[PDB]
Design a protein around this ligand. Structure first.
Ligand SMILES: Nc1nc2c(ncn2[C@@H]2O[C@H](COP(=O)(O)OP(=O)(O)NP(=O)(O)O)[C@@H](O)[C@H]2O)c(=O)[nH]1
Ligand SMILES: [Mg+2]
Ligand SMILES: [Mg+2]
Ligand SMILES: [Mg+2]
Ligand SMILES: [Mg+2]
Ligand SMILES: [Mg+2]
Ligand SMILES: [Mg+2]
Ligand SMILES: [Mg+2]
Ligand SMILES: [Mg+2]
Ligand SMILES: [Mg+2]
Ligand SMILES: [Mg+2]
Ligand SMILES: [Mg+2]
Ligand SMILES: [Mg+2]
Ligand SMILES: [Mg+2]
Ligand SMILES: [Mg+2]
Ligand SMILES: [Mg+2]
Ligand SMILES: [Mg+2]
Ligand SMILES: [Mg+2]
Ligand SMILES: [Mg+2]
Ligand SMILES: [Mg+2]
Ligand SMILES: [Mg+2]
Ligand SMILES: [Mg+2]
Ligand SMILES: [Mg+2]
Ligand SMILES: [Mg+2]
Ligand SMILES: [Mg+2]
Ligand SMILES: [Mg+2]
Ligand SMILES: [Mg+2]
Lengths: 205, 62, 509, 85
RNA sequence: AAUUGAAGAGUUUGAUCAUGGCUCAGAUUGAACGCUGGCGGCAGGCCUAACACAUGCAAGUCGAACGGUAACAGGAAGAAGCUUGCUUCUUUGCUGACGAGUGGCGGACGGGUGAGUAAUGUCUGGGAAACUGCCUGAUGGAGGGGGAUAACUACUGGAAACGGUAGCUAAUACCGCAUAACGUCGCAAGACCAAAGAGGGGGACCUUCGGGCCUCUUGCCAUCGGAUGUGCCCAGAUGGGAUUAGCUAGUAGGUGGGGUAACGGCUCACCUAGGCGACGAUCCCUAGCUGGUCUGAGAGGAUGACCAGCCACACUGGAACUGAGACACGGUCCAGACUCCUACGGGAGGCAGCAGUGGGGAAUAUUGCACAAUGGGCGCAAGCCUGAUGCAGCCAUGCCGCGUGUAUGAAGAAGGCCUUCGGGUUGUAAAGUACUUUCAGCGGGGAGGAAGGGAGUAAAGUUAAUACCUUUGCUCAUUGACGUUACCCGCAGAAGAAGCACCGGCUAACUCCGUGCCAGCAGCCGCGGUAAUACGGAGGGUGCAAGCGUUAAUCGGAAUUACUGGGC
């Protein structure tokens, strides 16, 4: 249920930083951004109108690390919900447990966030949760258990977590090593460079 | 009925009943089927590496 | 197979010989059964193992018939058994089938004890047997070669006491190694197919242990045992390394014989069984490509291309491999015979269909027609023949082959005639007046027209006409007339040779 | 197979021979009614009606003729005996 | 708050625009094959031969219905080998129980199957001329007699199944008499119909000292109702074909008789000459139908697996009995096909029950565990039976979730591939360094599915009675097939776990080499005859992921049957 191959190849193919290279050091420097995606990737960037719809599908999926079958269920769930389907698509992806672990800054990367959640270190409202796909709703507290607390893996992430955006929709805390999800994020608070109108089109046909 | 044999070369003749999947591709006059290589008594394509799913070629140990 | 536990076992014994030494009689008398001559053929064409309880201890008996045809059965029966017995008759002496059994005893490094079958007949003497088999290193007596001879009536039922003792002792002098509990393993005697019960096998278990829940793997076949049957006994709960028990519940009919090993779980044994199939299938296609490419030409270099096809399904698995080898012995260069789709048992739709595509005889050692089988056989023109014995089969297949031949060995001249004073006809273009010097000229018999000893033209007569009579036959020294189509030039002095055509017929050998 | 209702099979055989005899005698009283109706005897019609009345209603109480069949005999045969009379 | 949502591309021609077909992108399946494969949850799993079957099991249960000792668990009596305290072996139904048999209830339910049936069917909506055990409400009888019989004995026919003759014995078996409206039959007067006891305990007038009787529980009988189920009738809807246009004698209707529980040509005699039909009769072919499932924006189209309702069928064909209910899956009788047994006279069997085998077919499973739980059958209850059901095994068949590491790491290493030999790419990938131990493996702890039932007590309700029984508290012993349960904790160590298709355009993703109209690809237009991004291999890449791809089937696209929504 995971990629396991090279994370930067996914970032180089899209031509945008997916934040899988967050870790200790960030903002690339060493990159080779686009220019040679493969061996003959230096060929002209002209691409079909069908392909750019499929390209944006991969851009969103490769950030969070979701597979097409698992992603189809979130699109199917986003369609049945009220309001805009595109806005609810990213909302259900943002409602994942491992993503909320990444935003608060417990995991350094999004892959490490799923890695830490898999070992049952994260507890929500007291009870432990193994599954990274667990749906987080408003007024749901989250925290790391007494076992594996204040380790060099989790401690290094929380230090450098302050340097990033620091999202408004949840409290960072990091004093007692817990967190709280206040409300569902707004359209202005996410997306921007990634588009919702492009990704949604491909499943209509 | 009649059926095309895919792949490079075969041992197929006379007896030893073989599997026939079907499907239409147009080359000979009136050929509406295809034989399955690497099934029942039908030999697979020797020394093939790409497209192992088609033609019944097993994965080499490495 | 852990703990290294060593427990004594009942010795498995096989018996070999030339047909007719009353090899079966020895068993049946001990078994107090006498099933001999109760079955078709009067002789034993099948293999079976029967354990009896007699002092001292326990012993089981196995028997294989000795014939040119059963090359495999006697080979496998020797290596499986700890002790081999060779029956010999003072009247029969030594025979080429008996010496064949000698090799199976030494090559399998199995100790051998023998018995003189006839003490009843006055023309039978032991001294003849000892001396004539003396030449062969096997069967020494009191020469320091440790081998012991037994003299039994086999009809009289006379001991026997000595033979039995030798067998017990011969098994006693050598250490008997087995284990009561552990990993079960062994060999398969004979396998066949049943309609209600399903596919079954008769298995000798080297290490003796069994259970209804235990998974067993025979060759490339795998499965859980549904039930256990021992000889007459319909059900047995437990089976030891000594006594044989028929196994049931296997996926399909296994090989006629092989090594069988039980496993803890079936899932782990699935990949192994499928692995053996892949190798057996790979060599099957391998041997298929070689035989076809071996000729290195698009056809046969000569006229032996005419062949006969046969379809065989025998109830027992042991026969189809064994008798086919004997069925390939009768094969000849002229007419080639080949087996197609050897079955495990009975008959089936795809089998009758197999004989429908290519014309063939459908035969079985022992088989019955299925309800769906009768409909196909009765509709299209075919032949269903079942034979109790292999000898009646081996004879008729040859018969089928002998008939196939179409040889005419005679091209003797019927008459020879010289033509003179040609006449003209509208229909044939020419009429050559003739005078028969020898023999009788006939209408439809072929002719050879030759001039100066070389043949100018050849053909078959269309019209034989003398005057306006147009008689079909003309004798010698009687004026005659002749004409033929496609013959342009008639010249005097040439002679026409008419000859009848006859077929000698052919036999196979 | 030796199974369950072979006890009930011979009971139904006994019940058949019992009921077939009781149904046969039941009808013979009804059979004597139309003998008087087809003939010119008015007295024997009413006499035969009073003979069948006790026995036929008794079979309805037993639960073999099934209530309304026994009632229908008296319903039809009332209209026939007083037709000519 | 609740059926709120609609994609096109390629291909006729030198090129264009219409018309028009073919093909592809989508989703789905009771799937299969090919390759590959770690675990868990839930669901599904003979679509073809309604082809045939070995063995076990699938319906039995009441001594609180009644004769009974055929087993063994006690007690009792008696005779013995002896140990003065006990065993041993024949009698005894006194008893805890119980083989076989009689009787009652259930074998008409549960389960399976899609052969028939294009309408005695199903669906939807009504109607009156009917029945309905077990279970309930209402009002009364349960009085008094006789004659059998299985079992078991005495014989005898039989290989077996299974009887025959002659005695003996009870009953909630069976049959009379008496009793009789609120019932049935009648305009009325009248006529006429039923039964069964058994079990627990007990003062009083008490027994031929069986128990009457009082009382409680349960059952029987009759009638008017309730509920449920079943039967019957009408309307509408529910396949194709006009290359089937005429089809019907019980056929349509009436009267009378008989018949069904009940209306009726349901079935007869007689009378009349109608009935159905172009709004598709009849005939032929095909098919269970519906709630729904699949697809679709909707309308439609296709489809009737599992789940659930109804109908039909139970080796083939036909018939009736028992019973409230069957014209009966594991009942009986007869005929047909076919299996087994036999002393050859004569019997026995029906897996379209659960497993499973022969065989069909591309192909679909274990001859498992348990009544622990739900729900039936019987019984007062205990309890027994239950292949229904609950569970396990098997298969990646489908759906969903998780893992096969994460982070750092330039020497942009080695090797492979390409290279105009400057290098580029594989590539933060690997190695190395720093961390974690999920799911597997190993060792511990431990929910819930369990309420009851059983044995002692207390009060209350029945009652002549603080008996007894029932109900309601309380206390003490318990009842888990699944089950090395779910789950939680600890240990070791990145250890055990990634393949598959495709890359000419459509269609996301390109070079080299080999082969040279050869060998081959292809879903469509088409590629290859010496620079092939189309073949084969390698490198690289893309899509998807314990799946992947191909084929087959249905719809969409297809406004290409166009009602919505097209033309001549
Ligand atoms: N005179 C005599 N004849 C005997 C004796 N023993 C056996 N026989 C004969 O042998 C015959 C039986 O032979 P059998 O055992 O069937 O031979 P077989 O063992 O089947 N031969 P194979 O093994 O090759 O199939 C009988 O007919 C009998 O007359 C004996 O002691 N004396
Ligand atoms: Mg998945
Ligand atoms: Mg001889
Ligand atoms: Mg495999
Ligand atoms: Mg009437
Ligand atoms: Mg049972
Ligand atoms: Mg009993
Ligand atoms: Mg009496
Ligand atoms: Mg009665
Ligand atoms: Mg009245
Ligand atoms: Mg009365
Ligand atoms: Mg009475
Ligand atoms: Mg009428
Ligand atoms: Mg049908
Ligand atoms: Mg549409
Ligand atoms: Mg029938
Ligand atoms: Mg009846
Ligand atoms: Mg088959
Ligand atoms: Mg390099
Ligand atoms: Mg674990
Ligand atoms: Mg519990
Ligand atoms: Mg509870
Ligand atoms: Mg592209
Ligand atoms: Mg290819
Ligand atoms: Mg080239
Ligand atoms: Mg349409
Ligand atoms: Mg048009």
């Amino acid at each position: 249920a995971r990629y396991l191959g090279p994370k930067l190849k996914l970032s180089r193919r899209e031509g945008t930083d997916l934040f899988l290279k967050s870790g200790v050091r960030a903002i690339d420097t060493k990159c080779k951004i686009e220019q040679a995606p493969g061996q003959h990737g230096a060929r002209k960037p002209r691409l079909s109108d069908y392909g750019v719809q499929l390209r944006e599908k991969q851009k969103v999926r490769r950030i969070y690390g979701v597979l097409e079958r698992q992603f189809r269920n979130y699109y199917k769930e986003a369609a049945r919900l009220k309001g805009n389907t595109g806005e609810n698509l990213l909302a259900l992806l943002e409602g994942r447990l491992d993503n909320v672990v990444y935003r608060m800054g417990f995991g350094a990367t999004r892959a490490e966030a799923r890695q830490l959640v898999s070992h049952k270190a994260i507890m929500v409202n007291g009870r432990v949760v193994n599954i990274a796909s667990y749906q987080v709703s408003p007024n749901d507290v989250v925290s790391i258990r007494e076992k594996a607390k204040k380790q060099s893996r989790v401690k290094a992430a929380l230090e450098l977590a302050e340097q990033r955006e620091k999202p408004t929709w949840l409290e960072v805390d990091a004093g007692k090593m817990e967190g709280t999800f206040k409300r569902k994020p707004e359209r202005s608070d996410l997306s921007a460079d990634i588009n919702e109108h492009l990704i949604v089109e491909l499943y209509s046909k | 009925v009649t059926s095309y044999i895919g792949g490079e070369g075969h041992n197929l003749q006379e007896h030893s009943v073989i599997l026939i999947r079907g499907g239409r591709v147009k080359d000979l006059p009136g050929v509406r089927y295809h034989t399955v290589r690497g099934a029942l008594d039908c030999s697979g394509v020797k020394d093939r590496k790409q497209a192992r799913s088609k033609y019944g070629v097993k994965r080499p140990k490495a | 197979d852990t703990g290294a536990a060593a427990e004594p076992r009942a010795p498995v014994v096989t018996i070999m010989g030339h047909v007719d030494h009353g090899k079966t009689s020895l068993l049946d008398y001990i078994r107090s059964t006498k099933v001999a001559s109760g079955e078709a053929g009067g002789i034993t064409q099948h293999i079976g193992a029967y354990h009896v309880e007699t002092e001292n201890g326990m012993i089981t008996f196995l028997d294989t018939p000795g014939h040119a045809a059963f090359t495999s059965m006697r080979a496998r029966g020797a290596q499986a058994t700890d002790i081999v017995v060779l029956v010999v008759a003072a009247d029969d002496g030594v025979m080429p089938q008996t010496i064949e059994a000698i090799q199976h005893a030494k090559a399998a490094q199995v100790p051998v004890v023998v018995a003189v079958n006839k003490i009843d007949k006055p023309e039978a003497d032991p001294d003849r047997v000892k001396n004539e088999l003396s030449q062969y290193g096997i069967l020494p007596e009191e020469w320091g070669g440790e081998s012991q001879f037994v003299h039994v009536s086999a009809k009289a039922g006379t001991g026997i006491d000595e033979l039995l003792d030798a067998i017990l002792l011969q098994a006693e002098v050598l250490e008997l190694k087995a284990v009561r509990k552990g990993m079960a393993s062994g060999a398969v005697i004979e396998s066949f197919l049943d309609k209600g019960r399903g596919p079954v096998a008769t298995v000798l278990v080297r290490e003796g242990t069994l259970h209804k829940g235990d998974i067993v793997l025979c060759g490339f076949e795998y499965g859980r045992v549904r039930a256990m049957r021992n000889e007459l006994g319909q059900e047995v709960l437990e089976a030891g390394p000594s006594i044989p028990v028929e196994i049931l519940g296997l996926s399909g009919v296994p090989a006629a014989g092989d090594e069988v090993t039980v496993v803890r779980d079936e899932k782990k044994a699935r990949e192994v069984a499928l692995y053996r199939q892949g190798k057996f299938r790979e060599v099957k296609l391998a041997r298929q490509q070689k035989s076809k490419l071996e000729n290195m030409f698009a056809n046969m270099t000569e006229g032996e291309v005419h062949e006969v096809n046969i379809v065989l399904k025998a109830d027992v698995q042991g026969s189809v491999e064994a008798i086919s080898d004997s069925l390939l012995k009768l094969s000849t260069d002229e007419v080639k015979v080949k087996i197609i789709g050897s079955g495990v048992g009975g008959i089936t739709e795809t089998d009758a269909t197999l004989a429908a595509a290519s014309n063939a005889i459908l035969v079985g050692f022992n088989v019955r027609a299925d309800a769906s089988a009768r409909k196909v056989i009765e509709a299209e023109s075919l032949d269903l023949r079942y034979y109790s014995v292999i000898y009646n089969l081996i004879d008729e297949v040859k018969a089928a082959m002998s008939g196939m031949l179409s040889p005419e060995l005679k091209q003797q001249i019927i008459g020879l005639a010289e033509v003179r004073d040609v006449f003209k006809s509208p229909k044939f273009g020419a009429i050559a007046g003739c005078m028969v010097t020898e023999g009788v000229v006939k209408r439809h018999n072929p002719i050879r027209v030759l001039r100066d000893n070389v043949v100018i033209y050849e053909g078959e007569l269309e019209s034989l006409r003398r005057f306006k009579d147009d008689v079909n036959e003309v004798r010698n020294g009687m004026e005659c007339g002749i004409g033929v189509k496609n013959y342009n030039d008639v010249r005097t002095g040439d002679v026409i040779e008419v000859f009848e055509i006859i077929e000698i017929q052919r036999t196979i050998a | 197979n030796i199974k369950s209702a072979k006890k009930r099979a011979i009971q139904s055989e006994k019940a058949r021979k019992h009921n077939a005899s009781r149904r046969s005698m039941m009808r013979t009283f009804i059979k004597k009614v139309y003998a008087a109706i087809e003939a010119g005897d008015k007295a024997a019609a009413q006499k035969a009606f009073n003979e069948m009345q006790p026995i036929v209603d008794r079979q309805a109480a037993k639960g073999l003729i099934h209530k309304n069949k026994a009632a229908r005999h008296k319903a039809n045969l009332t209209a026939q005996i007083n037709k000519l009379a």
